[PDB]
Design a protein around this ligand. Structure first.
Ligand SMILES: O=C(O)[C@H]1CN(c2ncnc3[nH]c4cc(F)ccc4c23)CCO1
Length: 167
């Protein structure tokens, strides 16, 4: 038993809700919140900008130190950093950004990072400003992640389409 509430169960291990991940993160304090990161951990907009704003820019400060030490992530890769006031940990995961021409096949590699964590609150990778089809992202999530994932979808309209078209 865990504290996630109001989710629709899609599969054995994947759940979904119309929610603002920032507000869901502040209420659940999950062990892991996933950020829709880029390779530079520049949290300017989308989910990343919202999560970072909710940390009063502490996420960005920590991220800049991480990059200065380690260099950029790989597309499809991840790193674990602090969850600040939102979660114990933040798993920064880089999905491919279609608006940069990145290979959508890397989306599966991106979701594989979730399997290193037993339970996660997450957005749909490569959705929103990353330009991928959220219905495809949900399919890859379901077919790749084996650990327990609670997907927060900000847009109510989108959420209804994802549920209604789910196979
Ligand atoms: O923007 C993207 O990268 C993806 C995923 N994204 C989200 N998904 C779940 N919760 C979200 N809270 C937000 C607050 C914001 F200010 C901006 C985006 C979100 C958001 C929105 C749709 O497309």
């Amino acid at each position: 038993v865990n504290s996630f509430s109001g989710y629709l169960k899609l599969t054995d291990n994947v759940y979904i809700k119309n929610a603002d991940i920032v507000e869901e993160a502040k209420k659940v304090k999950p062990t892991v919140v996933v950020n829709a990161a880029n390779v530079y951990l520049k949290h300017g907009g989308g989910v990343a900008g919202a999560l970072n704003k909710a940390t009063n820019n502490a996420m960005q400060v920590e991220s800049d130190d991480y990059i200065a030490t380690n260099g950029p992530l790989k597309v499809g890769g991840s790193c674990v950093l602090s969850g600040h006031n939102l979660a114990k940990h933040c798993l920064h995961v880089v999905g491919p950004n279609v608006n940069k021409g990145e290979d959508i096949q890397l989306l599966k590699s991106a979701y594989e990072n979730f399997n290193q964590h037993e339970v996660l609150l997450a957005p749909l990778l490569s959705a929103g400003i990353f330009g991928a089809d959220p219905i495809h992202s949900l399919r890859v999530c379901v077919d790749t992640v084996r650990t327990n994932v609670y997907l927060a979808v900000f847009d109510k309209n989108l959420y209804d389409k994802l549920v209604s078209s789910f196979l």
